[PDB]
Design a protein around this ligand. Structure first.
Ligand SMILES: Nc1ncnc2c1ncn2[C@@H]1O[C@H](COP(=O)(O)OP(=O)(O)OP(=O)(O)O)[C@@H](O)[C@H]1O
Ligand SMILES: [Mg+2]
Lengths: 166, 338, 355, 84, 167, 119
């Protein structure tokens, strides 16, 4: 039972990877290796993501995925299986990485940038979303003020509109 | 980084013209050959309806320019194009060679000579799909074009700048009256006064090549090959060629119209033009409409015909006269296309 | 050289999908081949679906197929054995003799997909061709290289007209007609073959004057849409290499149009007007433009046309009407009561009947 | 079986329109491309395969025979319908 | 926009990368309305008979590259998503012979008249090609229907096809 | 204010798709701008597709549109000259005087899309 629903659409690969990790072990090692892989592919973007084009044959895809696994075989666990299945299936490998990160962070982090009427950015490193938002908001208002820019807050403008409407 | 660098270098080989060379910015790769379309990856500086070569002699003009790849229609048989072929952009919008070096010659929808009389002399290359003149430049029709038919002269008179439609069944003599007009033009086309000189253009959409050859022979017999240009799109030709030919012929006529002269253009069987456009649209997964004709069948004929009108004196007082031919099926003028 | 090989991925009805390797995909309309115990299943490539996969249409029954079976590319389109040896033999769409009188000893082998003669090579004069039949060559004369449409029926001597035309053209100029039984009923076909032997037009021990190519009605769709092309290739070879005034007989052009519409539906194309393929006009023009007169010789086609629901307005009849020149409406027992030809001269018309 | 064993047999296919309707159901439920009034493509091919199997064998093969009597029901007298 | 969504659909939904030897066996992916998509059956043939874990039989019309679409001879109640499926190895066939006389059978040769087992002289394929063009002869022997209207105006012959068209 | 700028991604016939940047999404039915060699090509926004991409309608021909061309947001719906000066002046779908009788000297400019006058 994965914590979150990715609702498929190229996101089922991330859920499958997370379930394969959860069935035995290595929730973190596979994910950090995948982060390193994404760092490598963004290291040489003209050779990194241009090579994820669909005009690239199947054995070309096998060659590129074999080329990915270097530097002391950083691809550890079932991530090599993910590269293989992406070779004979949909190619570009960025979005499902983000989906998998979203899933693992829900497993461990549970941080959401709420604030309702306030446009703050209060990430919350805690699984209990009960009162820690108060401390997060207090810290983010006491210092920083990243945007906190409602431009104009909704209640007064909408109330004036409805009042003048009768 | 040395191992990653060298393995990326060997990755740069065997991919060849898909990311490596030209960056697929002025070139492309055929992803899949469809019904009459060719999905091509690459061509990052391509503009819409830009003429493209498929490295096989066949031409193409781009409708679909979605972010992933570009959808290209095939100006010819799709057997020539192959998935994985390299394509290159010509850098110009679809255009036809125009000028006074075309009379007495017959060409296709791309201006390539078919008569075998040699290359075509061109004074320019105007776009096939050009904007019609606005509201300001036009002027009311006043000079009569003489068809030679007593019925068409005394009754239903036709002037220079007027679009008169020839409607009839399969065998009624629409081609006959058009040919009578083009031959009657001989009286003034052999003189000196250019204001009465009327050059002619014939458009063959979906007609038999044998019929076109017989027609050319008939113009040969009455010395009508001069001051006349014939564009041919036979029934065996690909649908895009037929769909494009009328616009190119319109450009040919507009050359004379904007150069102060007067031109006659005959759009023979625009019904088969609409049929070819319908085939192209349903091969493009476009929603069918009334009798499955796509909604832009009106827009096609509209943009095609409105490019023929009398110009005012400030432009040069040129004129372009269009004579469309529509085959009503069943002797009814209450059908959608009619 | 290294043969081009691939693996079958899916057979969906008559449609067969085959995956090839890198830089090995053929062009479309090319002929593919697999080894089945029954014989040769041949596949005509229709579309490239990407990822080194091609969509092909089967010319023969696709039963007992397994994904991963080996396939071989011929190199070009379906090539039919062509030559004077074809006369007297029963040949099919794939070019295999179904007459079981030994193999075909034709020296040449031409593809069925070709282009019509260019505009320059087209003859610039409307020519007359003697038919032998008095009423025909007087009131509705046939065009040398025309597209004559036989508007007959049943019990009107439609066949006997055909054999009389074959004999008359064989005697007159050079006629070696080619009969194309598109959608052959395989009973009328056997009767026709027996009549060929009896009438002497087909001479087993001697020389024949007609080659009988026909795909039976039980064949999968597409073969019925290619038998006409095979016969047209045979006729074009007999014209472009011998200079004869060849004839060509179509069993029913309406059946060819129905097969063409049927093929498009299987591929996935949207039927355009009345369950009809969007490429109806294109296919009709492609078929009817190669049947024409040239500088060397001429080929005249006599096609039998069926009018659905007796509706002259149906799209397929109109598309055929685009290419007819002259027509012959055999009287349904009107003139058959009496005059043997029974052509109904007041209904059969001709475009060439001009001074 | 009877035809190839030299005997003569009579076959009454009866309702073939219902058979075509069944094939329509099959093809539509398998996501195959529909056609005229949503009928599958290879229904003409289907009925051709079914009907051409009946024949009159020659003497060399046993002089067998199969006479087919299909029964097609038409709606409202429309003999111009696709299956008819 | 740098990139777009890779997948809008996928035949593969359980990427565990295990479970080989699904050439003669398979797994039910989805079922409903008398059809059942099955993953596996790498050696299945066209229209081949197939057997399910619940005892109901199937016929392999649709074999996509990923899954095979099996049409079902019984109710969809018996089958489930995730049942094991085995191929039978034979194409559609029926017991043929002279023992069929006087008996009523099903569309596959099962006796439905309740008179006992069926005696058969053989088992021919249901889908068999028709005789060719030469092994046939002209129809000459008449079929006497007993209707004077039929037997006089529209004669029927041994080896003919006649349509009974009507409302 | 800063000029809202984006990149053209898709040009589908008369339909143009434009990708924009952080919180730079324009409004529906709001005029955009493409600097064409001939003149000004406005892109009225029809629908929002997400991911900072909007589907737009071109008021002129889309000839010569290359993917990735610079786009400019007008900031509102199509604006046309309004007033008695327009009498005798022939204008177009955008409002430019096509009567070549000089520039229009309108005092007010109003949005094209309004609302019904209630009860
Ligand atoms: N004025 C005329 N005098 C004599 N014959 C004519 C005349 N006009 C037409 N015809 C004849 O009528 C027939 C049809 O005429 P035409 O060749 O112009 O075709 P159409 O009606 O325009 O169309 P289509 O090419 O589709 O048949 C031809 O046989 C032609 O010779
Ligand atoms: Mg005509």
């Amino acid at each position: 039972p994965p914590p979150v629903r990715l609702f498929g659409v190229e996101g089922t690969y991330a859920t499958a990877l997370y379930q394969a990790a959860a069935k035995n072990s290595s929730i973190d090692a596979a994910f950090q290796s995948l982060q390193k892989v994404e760092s490598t592919v963004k290291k040489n973007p003209k050779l990194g993501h241009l090579l994820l084009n669909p005009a690239l044959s199947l054995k070309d895809r096998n060659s590129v995925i074999d080329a990915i696994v270097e530097t002391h075989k950083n691809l550890d666990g079932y991530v090599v299986n993910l590269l293989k299945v992406l070779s004979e299936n949909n190619r570009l490998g960025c979005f499902e990485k983000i989906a998998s990160d979203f899933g693992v962070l829900n497993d461990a982090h549970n941080g959401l940038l709420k604030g309702t009427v306030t446009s703050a950015e209060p990430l919350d490193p805690k699984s209990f979303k009960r009162i820690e938002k108060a401390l997060s908001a207090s810290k983010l208002v006491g210092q920083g003020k990243s945007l906190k820019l409602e431009n104009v807050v909704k209640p007064e403008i909408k109330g004036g509109l409805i009042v003048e409407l009768g | 980084k040395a191992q990653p660098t060298e393995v990326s270098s060997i990755l740069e080989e065997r991919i060849k013209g898909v990311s490596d060379e030209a960056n697929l910015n002025e070139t492309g790769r055929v992803l899949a050959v469809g019904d009459g379309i060719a999905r091509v990856f690459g061509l990052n500086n391509i503009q819409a309806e830009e003429l493209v070569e498929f490295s096989s002699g066949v031409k193409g003009m781009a409708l679909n320019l979605e972010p992933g790849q570009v959808g290209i229609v095939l100006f010819g048989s799709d057997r020539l194009v192959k998935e994985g072929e390299l394509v290159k952009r010509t850098g110009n919008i679809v255009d036809v060679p125009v000028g006074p070096g075309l009379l007495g010659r017959v060409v296709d929808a791309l201006g390539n000579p078919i008569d075998g009389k040699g290359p075509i002399d061109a004074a320019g290359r105007s776009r096939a799909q050009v904007k019609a003149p606005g509201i300001l430049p036009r002027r009311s029709v006043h000079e009569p074009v003489q068809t030679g038919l007593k019925a068409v002269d005394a009754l239903v008179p036709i002037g220079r700048g007027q679009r008169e439609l020839i409607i009839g069944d399969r065998q009624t003599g629409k081609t006959a009256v058009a040919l009578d007009t083009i031959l009657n033009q001989k009286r003034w086309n052999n003189g000196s006064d250019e204001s009465k000189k009327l050059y002619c253009v014939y458009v063959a959409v979906g007609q038999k090549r044998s019929t076109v050859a017989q027609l050319v022979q008939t113009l040969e017999q009455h010395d009508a090959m001069k001051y006349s240009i014939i564009v041919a799109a036979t029934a065996s030709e690909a649908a895009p060629l037929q769909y494009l030919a009328p616009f190119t012929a319109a450009s040919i006529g507009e050359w004379f119209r904007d150069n102060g002269k007067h031109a006659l253009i005959v759009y023979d069987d625009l019904s088969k033009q609409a049929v070819a456009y319908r085939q192209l649209s349903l091969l493009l997964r476009r929603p069918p409409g009334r009798e499955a004709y796509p909604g832009d069948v009106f827009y096609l004929h509209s943009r095609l015909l409105e490019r023929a009108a009398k110009l005012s004196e400030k432009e040069g007082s040129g004129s372009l006269t269009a004579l469309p031919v529509i085959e009503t099926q069943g002797g009814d003028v209450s059908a959608y296309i009619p | 050289s290294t043969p081009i090989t691939g693996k079958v991925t899916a057979v969906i009805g008559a449609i067969v999908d085959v995956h090839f390797e890198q830089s090995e995909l053929p062009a479309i309309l090319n002929a593919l081949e697999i080894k089945t115990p029954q014989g040769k299943l041949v596949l005509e490539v229709a579309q490239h679906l990407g990822e080194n996969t091609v969509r092909t249409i089967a010319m023969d029954g696709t039963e007992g197929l397994v994904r991963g079976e080996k396939v071989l590319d011929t190199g070009g389109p379906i090539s039919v054995p062509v030559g004077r040896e074809t006369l007297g033999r029963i040949i099919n769409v794939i070019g295999e003799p179904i007459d079981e009188r030994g193999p075909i000893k034709s020296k040449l082998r031409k593809p069925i997909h070709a282009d019509p003669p260019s505009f320059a090579e087209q003859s610039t004069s409307a020519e007359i061709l003697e038919t032998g039949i008095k009423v025909v060559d007087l009131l509705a004369p046939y065009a040398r290289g025309g597209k004559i449409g036989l508007f007959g029926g049943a019990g009107v001597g439609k066949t006997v007209f055909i054999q009389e035309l074959i004999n008359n053209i064989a005697k007159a100029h050079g006629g070696f007609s080619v009969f194309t039984g598109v959608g052959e009923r395989t009973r009328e076909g056997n009767d026709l073959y027996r009549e060929m032997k009896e009438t002497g037009v087909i001479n087993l021990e001697g020389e024949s004057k007609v080659a009988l190519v026909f795909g039976q009605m039980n064949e999968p769709p597409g073969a019925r849409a290619r038998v006409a092309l095979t016969g047209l290739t045979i006729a074009e070879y007999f014209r472009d290499e011998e200079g004869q005034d060849v004839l060509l007989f179509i069993d029913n052009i309406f059946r060819f149009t129905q097969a063409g519409s049927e093929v498009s539906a299987l591929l996935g194309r949207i039927p355009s007007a009345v369950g009809y393929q969007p490429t109806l006009a294109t296919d009709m023009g492609l078929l009817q433009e190669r049947i024409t007169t040239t500088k060397k010789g001429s080929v005249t086609s006599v096609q039998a046309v069926y009018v659905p629901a007796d509706d002259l307005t149906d799209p397929a009849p109109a598309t055929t009407f685009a290419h007819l020149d002259a027509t012959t409406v055999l009287s349904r027992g009107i003139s058959e009561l009496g005059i043997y030809p029974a052509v109904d001269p007041l209904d059969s018309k001709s475009r060439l009947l001009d001074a």
